[PDB]
Amino acid sequence: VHLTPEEKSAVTALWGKVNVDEVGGEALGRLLVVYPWTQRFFESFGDLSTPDAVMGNPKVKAHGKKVLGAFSDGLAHLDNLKGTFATLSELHCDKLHVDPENFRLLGNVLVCVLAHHFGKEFTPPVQAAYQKVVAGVANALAH
Amino acid sequence: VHLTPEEKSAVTALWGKVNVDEVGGEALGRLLVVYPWTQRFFESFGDLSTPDAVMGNPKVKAHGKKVLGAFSDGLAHLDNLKGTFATLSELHCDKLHVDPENFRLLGNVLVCVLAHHFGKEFTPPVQAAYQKVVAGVANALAH
Amino acid sequence: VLSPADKTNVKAAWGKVGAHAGEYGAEALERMFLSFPTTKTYFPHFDLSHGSAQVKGHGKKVADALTNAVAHVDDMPNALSALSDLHAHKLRVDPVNFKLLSHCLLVTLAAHLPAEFTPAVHASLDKFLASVSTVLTSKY
Amino acid sequence: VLSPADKTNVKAAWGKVGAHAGEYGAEALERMFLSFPTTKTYFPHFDLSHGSAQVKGHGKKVADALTNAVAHVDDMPNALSALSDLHAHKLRVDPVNFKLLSHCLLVTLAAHLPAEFTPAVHASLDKFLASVSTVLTSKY
Ligand code: HEM
Ligand code: HEM
Ligand code: HEM
Ligand code: HEM
C-alpha cells in the first residue's frame, strides 16, 4: 500500500494504542453479529446464537487476537502485503472457500471498532489511511 | 485462466459462431438496461431512456463491438490476461473510475447474451468455461 | 423495490415458464454446481452429478418456491418467511451464492425462452431475484 | 428486511443521534470524500474541503432524509420516492458508493456514540442503511 509519511505515522501512532486482546474479538464478534452468514465458517466455536453469546465467546476472542496478529504483521509489511498473505490467502481461498467480499466486510468492521475505541482520536484522515490499509489487506487475501 | 483442452475447444468452437456486430451492442445494451447506473458512464451516447432507445442506439452497437474486440483479444491470450488488459485497466480505473464489480456485471450479462444466442447449444459446461473466462477478464481489468 | 411494470414483466415471464419450472430450476442448479463449485459445499448430502434425481427434485422445490414468490410479489417477506428461516438461520448461506444462482436462473431463462428475454424482462427478473435474495438472506 | 427488534434499535439509536444529526452527516460526508475519493465525482459543483459550508448543509440534508426514513421505516419506498427519483433517475449513483457512505455513517456513529454502538445496534443500523441504499438505487 502506497501511503504518505503522515498516514504511516498516523496508522503507527494509533495502532500502538490498540488493545489487541480486545479489538480482535471485538472486530471478529461484530463480524459474526452484523454479517451472520460468516457464522457458518465458525460453527466449531460453540454457541453463536445471540450477540451477547458471540461477544462473550472465548474462541472468538482468541481467534480475533489471531486476526489482529495478521493485521499487525500486515502493518509491518505495507509494501509486501501479497508476500505476507500468501499462506493465509491459500487457507482462506482453498481450504475454507471464504468469498473475497467477506474480507472487505471484516476490514470495514475493524475500522468501525477502531472508531468505537478512539472516538475523536479517529479523525477522517486516520480513517482514510486505515481504509486504504484495510483494502490492501483484503485485496492481498483475495488473491 | 486455467482451462482444460475441452473447455478451450468449447469456448473456441462456440465463439467462432458469435456475431460480433450483435452480441457486442446487445451485451452492452443489456448492461445499460439491467444495471442503469452504468448509463452514467455513457452519457455521451445520446438517448438512453427506454430499453428500445438503448438497443436502438448506434454508439452502443459500435462500442459493444469494441468490447467484444477486447473479449476476443482476451480469448487469444488466456494465459496473459493481465498483460492484455493493462491499458484497459489503466483506462477503466484511472480515467473512468469504473468500480471493479461493474466488470463482473458486464461479464455475466455477456454470458446471458451467449445463452440467448445459442440456447441448448450453450450447455452448462460451456457456461462453466465462459464463467472462468469472464471472471478472468473481470479480474484482469480490476487490477 | 419493484415498479408496477417489472411486476408485470416477472408475472408474465414466469407465467410463460409454467410447467417447465422444475426442469429450469434443475438446470439452473446444475449450472450453478458446475460453473460455481463452491456452492457444492452447501449440499454435502446430495448426489451432484448431471441428471441426478435429487438435484431434479430440489430444482422442482426451488422453482415452486419462485412461483410462490411471483404469486405473492408484493408481500415477499410474509410469504417467504419459512424459507428465510431456512436459508438465513439454519443454513446461513452467503448472499454471494444467491447472486450466483440468480445468474444461473437468468442463463436458463436465456437458453430456453429467447422470445421472452426482452432486455426489460431481463432487468425485471434480475430485480425480482435480487429481491428474493434480499428476503432469504435476512432474519426476521 | 428488518425485524421488529432492529426497527426498535434503529429508532432508538437514531433518536439518540437527534440534534447532532447535521454534524454527523457532514462528518460522514467528509469521511466518504476523504477515504473514498471517487465519490467526489458526484459533486463537481461543491467545495469539498474540510469544514466547508456546502458539505455541512448537504450533510444536514442527508441526515434529515435518514431521520424521516427512520420515521417511515415500515414503508420506506413511498417515503423516499422523491430521493429515489433523484439518486436513481437523475444522478445514476453506483450502489457501491451507497455502501461506502453507509460505512462512513457507521464510523461516525462509532466515533460519537460508543455507549450506543452495541453490536446489535450495529447490525440494525447496517441493514437499515442497506435498506435505504436498496430503496434509493432502485428505480420504480
Ligand atoms: C480480512 C482479514 C482476515 C484476516 C487478517 C484473517 C486472519 C486469519 C488468520 C491469521 C488465520 C489463521 C488461524 C490459525 O491458523 O490458527 C485465520 C483463519 C481462519 N479464518 Fe480468517 N482472516 C480474515 C478474514 C476472514 C473472514 C472474513 C473469514 C470468514 C467469514 C475468515 C475465516 C477464517 C476461518 C474459518 C479460519 C480457520 C479458523 C478455524 O477453523 O477455527 N477469515 N484467519
Ligand atoms: C469485462 C468488461 C469490459 C471490457 C472488456 C471493456 C472494454 C473496453 C474497451 C475495448 C474500450 C475502448 C477503449 C478505447 O476505445 O480507447 C472501453 C472503454 C470504455 N469502457 Fe469498457 N470494458 C469493460 C467494462 C466496462 C464497464 C462495466 C463499464 C461501465 C459501467 C465500462 C465503461 C467504459 C467507458 C466509459 C469507456 C470509454 C468509452 C467512451 O467514453 O465513449 N467498461 N472498454
Ligand atoms: C432464489 C433463490 C432460492 C430459492 C427460492 C430456494 C428455495 C429453496 C427451497 C424450496 C428449498 C427446500 C426447502 C425444504 O425442502 O425444506 C431450499 C433448500 C435449500 N437451499 Fe435453497 N433456494 C434458493 C437459493 C439457494 C442458494 C443460492 C443456496 C446455496 C448456494 C441454497 C441452498 C439450499 C440448501 C443447502 C437447502 C437444503 C436442501 C436440503 O437440505 O436437502 N439455496 N431452498
Ligand atoms: C445513503 C443515504 C443517502 C441519503 C439519505 C441521501 C440523501 C440526499 C439528499 C437529502 C439530497 C438533497 C436533495 C436535494 O437537495 O434536492 C441528496 C442529493 C445528492 N446526493 Fe445523496 N443521499 C444518500 C447517498 C448518496 C451517495 C452515496 C451519493 C454519491 C456518492 C449521493 C450523491 C448525491 C448527490 C450528487 C446529490 C446532489 C447534490 C446537489 O444537488 O447539490 N447521495 N441526497
Numbering used by the authors:
A (entry chain B), B (entry chain D): 1 to 143
C (entry chain C), D (entry chain A): 1 to 140
What did the published study say regarding this structure?
Khoshouei et al. recently demonstrated that a TEM operating at 300 keV combined with a Volta phase plate (VPP) and quantum energy filter could be used to resolve human hemoglobin (Hb), a ~64-kDa heterotetrameric heme-containing protein, to ~3.2 Å resolution. We therefore sought to determine the structure of Hb using similar strategies. Briefly, vitrified Hb specimens were prepared from lyophilized human Hb (Sigma Aldrich). UV-VIS absorbance measurements of the solubilized Hb sample confirmed that the bound heme was indeed in the ferric (Fe3+) oxidation state, hereby referred to as methemoglobin (metHb). RELION reference-free 2D classification yielded detailed class averages exhibiting secondary-structural elements and various recognizable views of tetrameric metHb. Three parallel 3D classifications were performed to select for unique particles comprising the best-resolved classes across each classification. Local resolution estimates indicated that most of both maps were resolved to better than ~3.5 Å, which is consistent with our ability to resolve side-chain densities throughout the maps. Notably, the heme pockets are estimated to be the best-resolved regions in both states, and the quality of the heme densities in both α and β subunits of state 1 enabled us to confidently discern the location of the vinyl groups extending from the porphyrin ring to unambiguously assign the orientation of the heme moiety in each pocket. Our ability to discern subtle conformational differences in a target as small as 64 kDa effectively underscores the utility of this approach in examining the conformational dynamics of similarly small biological systems. Moreover, the results of our work with ADH and mHb demonstrate that small-molecule ligands and discrete conformational states within a single sample, respectively, can be resolved using conventional SPA even for smaller complexes.
